[PDB]
Design brief:
320 residues, alpha+beta, Transferase(Phosphotransferase), domain 1, 2 domains, five-stranded antiparallel sheet, three-stranded antiparallel sheet, 11 helices, globular, binds the ligand Nc1ncc(-c2cccc(N3CCNCC3)c2)cc1C(=O)Nc1ccncc1, transferase, Kinase, Atypical kinase, phosphorylation
């Protein structure tokens, strides 16, 4: 198609802005990475999430997918509002009311996956996304793990060093408890204005053996959700309860004010509508300088003859 700009450029994939007559966002994964022994799982996994997550309001939905021999292309809806990381620098710290809006919606998003069996595990201020209306969307279903949820604890050992679950660092079996810990780090940063880790391999040690300091300015309800969400024990941690895990989150005093049936229909009013910039909304969003020009890398024949398109079959075909 016609490719307007490069949005993000991770090692596994490249995110670039496109049009065809609506603006869309495209994540392109080279096929050599995913086509191997027990590697096909990441492309397949993300598709399943995207299929299950596209109906949900908060998790981002996927228009189309196409296949070329050299790469696999994902077309995802363009969100205009902005990422939280830019918001956090525009406003060092956010009120507790703003955090309740965002964090409440995020907990709904994670529960949907938890019910479905998927662990986001890439929860970050950047991975959340804001629409022009002020709601939240979660972006990169890439590190997710799906297909095993009730009575299943599995160790895939993925996380981000700052948002990493303490139980995971230990080498222990990880449930959906990691995702809730990531929430508390998110909530922490927005309300306090700083990472809870006073911010290489030193972080893993701090998280496991250093105390978390709640700002004195923080409301007592806020301290408790942080303490319970950022709790080191997966069994003690809030919302990792096997039976009654969402109600206690939902009935926590910090999130008493919300109406979650009402908020899920986007009925509740966002605290601050994001700034309306050019139809693209490129101004509000961060601008990363890895590759300013969008030129897809020229293919090498020797790889291309090795890739099996049997594995990459049934792409271009998306279920619900
Ligand atoms: N759907 C989207 N709509 C808009 C944006 C967007 C728009 C402008 C700038 C940015 N930035 C990302 C953060 N770094 C600075 C550039 C993202 C991203 C996405 C999106 O899905 N992204 C994404 C990123 C990584 N894996 C899957 C999906």
């Amino acid at each position: 198609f016609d490719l307007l700009r490069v949005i993000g450029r991770g090692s596994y994939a490249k995110v670039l802005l496109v049009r065809l007559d609506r603006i869309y966002a495209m994540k392109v994964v080279k096929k050599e990475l995913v086509n191997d022994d027990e590697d096909i799982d990441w492309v397949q996994t993300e598709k399943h999430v995207f299929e299950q997550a596209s109906n949900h309001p908060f998790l981002v939905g996927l228009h189309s997918c196409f296949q070329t021999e050299s790469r696999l292309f994902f077309v995802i809806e363009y969100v205009n509002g902005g990422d939280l990381m830019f918001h956090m620098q525009r406003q060092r710290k956010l009120p507790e009311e703003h955090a309740r809006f965002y964090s409440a919606e995020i907990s709904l998003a994670l529960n949907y996956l938890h019910e479905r069996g998927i662990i986001y595990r890439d929860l970050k201020l950047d991975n959340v996304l804001l629409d022009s209306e002020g709601h939240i969307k979660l972006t990169d279903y890439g590190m997710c793990k799906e297909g095993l949820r009730p009575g299943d604890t599995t160790s895939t050992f993925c996380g981000t060093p700052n948002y990493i679950a303490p139980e995971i660092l230990r080498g222990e079996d990880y449930g959906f408890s990691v995702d809730w810990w990531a929430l508390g780090v998110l909530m922490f940063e927005m309300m306090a204005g700083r990472s809870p880790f006073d911010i290489e391999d030193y972080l893993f040690q701090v998280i496991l053996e250093k105390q978390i300091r709640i700002p004195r300015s923080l409301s007592v309800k806020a301290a408790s959700v942080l303490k319970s969400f950022l709790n080191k024990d997966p069994k003690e941690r809030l919302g990792c309860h096997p039976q009654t895990g969402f109600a206690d989150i939902q009935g926590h005093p910090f999130f008493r004010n919300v109406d979650w049936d009402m908020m899920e229909q986007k009925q509740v009013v966002p605290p601050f509508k994001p700034n309306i910039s050019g139809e693209f909304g490129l101004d509000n969003f961060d601008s990363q300088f890895t590759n300013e020009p969008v030129q897809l890398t020229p293919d090498d024949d020797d790889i291309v003859r090795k890739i099996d398109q049997s594995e990459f079959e049934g792409f271009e075909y998306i279920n619900p």
